[PDB]
Each structure stands twice: as structure tokens, then as C-alpha cells.
Amino acid sequence: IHVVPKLPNSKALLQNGVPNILSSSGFKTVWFDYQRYLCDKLTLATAGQSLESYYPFHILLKTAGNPLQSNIFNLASSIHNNHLFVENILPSAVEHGTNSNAVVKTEPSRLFLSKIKDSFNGSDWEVVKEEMIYRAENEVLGQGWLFLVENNEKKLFILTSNNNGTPYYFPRNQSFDLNSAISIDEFATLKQMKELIGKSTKLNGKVQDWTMPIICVNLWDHAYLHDYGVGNRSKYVKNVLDNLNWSVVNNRIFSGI
């Protein structure tokens, strides 16, 4: 059985929500209700099978290449992504429930701000945030996820997913919406991806991708509607990126010590 992880300072979260982003009701929808909804569905889908003993991140990797396990993949991807989002927007990862700590001033580290300049042609963090807000509004028509990811070449770049698209495995990033029209450049990207997946010799037709997320923003209606409303998702993404927990985001960047 997959159970909803306990979050630090949960009593505060159930009373005052997440300050500057979500209210108490908004946080109950995104985490206490939706995470319960996902875990229960995952348990029903995977109970009695070998996947029941694997954590959601491993399930999505195991099932990423199986077309008829997409339902399990979607549930595992959403569960992993949601706790990635709830973790970097959380007031404090440490449990100051008995310490009553009210001073958590976390700021981008030097390694993060050094990789931002290197990967964005000298753009500042503030400018990159504006690009992230723009990318979310123009690339995610409906539900999806906004990620700041790091690849095998030490370069930070922006990835957006539609519905439950994993950042780890490019064949399942779901960054192109094929319901609408696509340019010849987008079709070239899809065609090149298909060729890479066909070069793999494995009988499971799987490729190697070492991309890892650094920041996760939930763009689903379960996270913003109640507090922001239809059409105000760009005000929600702005608040999330301005009140990130950088103790968690800094730890996600590999330092090498």
C-alpha cells in the first residue's frame, strides 16, 4: 500500500496553509486530498503485482516504456511530481514544530546562480523567472508541470510537461501538445527523439536519460483554482517562484563533495 508521506510542520499546514502561495483550503486540495486520491488509485492499480514494492519514482522508470501501463505511469509520475512541488514550496523542511521557528530566510546559492548565468547567456534569476512564467502560459494550455531541470552537460534549462509528464525520461516528457498544430521544427524534434529510441538495442526499447529536476511547480487546477481562479495561473506561478524553499532546491544541485 502506498501511503501519503507525512509532511514537516503538518499542523501549521492544516491551519495557515502555505504563506504567500496557498491558503489552508488550497493546500488541503493539492496535498491532503489529491495526494490521497493519487496514492489510493496507485495502490488499486499496483496491489497484487510486483510494482507494489517499488517507490513511485522507480515505478515510473520501470513503466515508462510500456504503452499499456501508461495509467500506472501517470499515477506514479503525478505522485512523484506533486511531492517535488510541495517540497520546494514548503516553509521549512526541518520540523520546527517544537522549536517554533519563524525565521526561514532561504536564498539561491552561488552554484545555482552560477549555473543560471552559464546556461541562460548571462540572464539573471529574475529574468529566468519571467521566462518560466511565460513558458507556462504559452506551452501548457491545460494541466501540466513546470520544471527547471539539469542535464548531463551541467546546463540548466526549462521543461514544461502536459498532464503527467516526467522530467527524467525525455520520451515521456510530454512537452508537445499534438492536439493542436505543430511547426516543422517541433516535428523534427519528435522525429529525432523517435530515432534515438530506435537505436537502443534493449528488448524493452529504453534509452538513457540523466536529466534531473531542480524546481517543480504544479500547474494543475488542484493547486491554484480555489485561491487564484480560472485565468490567474500566471499570478500563481509568480508567487510560487518567489517563495521557493532554497534549502531544498540548493540540495538538488550536485556539488561533488
Partner 1 sequence: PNNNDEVMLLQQKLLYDEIRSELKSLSQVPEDEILPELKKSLEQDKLSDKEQQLEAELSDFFRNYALLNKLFDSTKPYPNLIPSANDKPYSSQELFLRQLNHSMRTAKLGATISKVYYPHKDIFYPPLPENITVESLMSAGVHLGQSTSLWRSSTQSYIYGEYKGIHIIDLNQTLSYLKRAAKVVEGVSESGGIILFLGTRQGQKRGLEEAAKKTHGYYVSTRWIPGTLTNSTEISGIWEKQEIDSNDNPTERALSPNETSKQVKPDLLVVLNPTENRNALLEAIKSRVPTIAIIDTDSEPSLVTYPIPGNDDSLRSVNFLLGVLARAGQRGLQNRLARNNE
Partner 2 sequence: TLAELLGRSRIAQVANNHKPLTYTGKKFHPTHQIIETKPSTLYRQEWGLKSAIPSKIKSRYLVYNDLDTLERITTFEPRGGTQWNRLRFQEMGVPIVSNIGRQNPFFKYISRPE
Partner 3 sequence: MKIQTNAVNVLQRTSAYLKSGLLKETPAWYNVVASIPPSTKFTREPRFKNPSNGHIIGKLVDVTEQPHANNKGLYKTRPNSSDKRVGVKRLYRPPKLTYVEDRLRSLFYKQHPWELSRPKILVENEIGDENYDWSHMLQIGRPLDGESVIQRTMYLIKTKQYGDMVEAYDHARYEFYALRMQEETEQQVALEEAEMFGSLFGVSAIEHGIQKEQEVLDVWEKKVVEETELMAARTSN
Q: Which residues bind partner 2 (CB under 8 A)?
A: 49-50, 53, 67-68
84-94 core/surface letters (b: 16 or more CB in 10 A; e: else): bbbbbbbbbbe
- Sheet architecture: strand order including 156-162: 156-162, 144-150, 212-218
How many angstroms separate the CA atoms of 210 and 221, rounded? 29
To partner 2, the closest distance from the beta carbon of 53 in angstroms equals: 6
The smaller minimum CB distance to partner 2, of residues 42 and 116, is found at: 42
Mapping DSSP to helix (H, G, I), strand (E, B) and coil, where does residue 140 land? coil
**Residue 195, burial from CB neighbour count under 10 angstroms (0-12, 13-18, 19+):** exposed
Between 53 and 180, whose beta carbon lies closer to partner 2? Answer: 53
For partner 1, what does the binding mask look like between residues 38 and 67, x meaning CB under 8 A? -x--x---------xx-xxxx---------
d(CA 209, CA 193): 12
Residue 80 in contact with partner 1, rule: CB under 8 A: yes
Site for partner 1 in 201-220 (CB under 8 A): 210, 212-213
Query: Does 113 engage in binding with partner 1 (CB under 8 A)?
Result: no
Task: Name the residues that contact partner 1, by CB under 8 A.
Answer: 1-5, 39, 42, 52-53, 55-58, 76, 79-80, 82-84, 87, 109-111, 152-154, 210, 212-213, 251-252, 254, 256-257
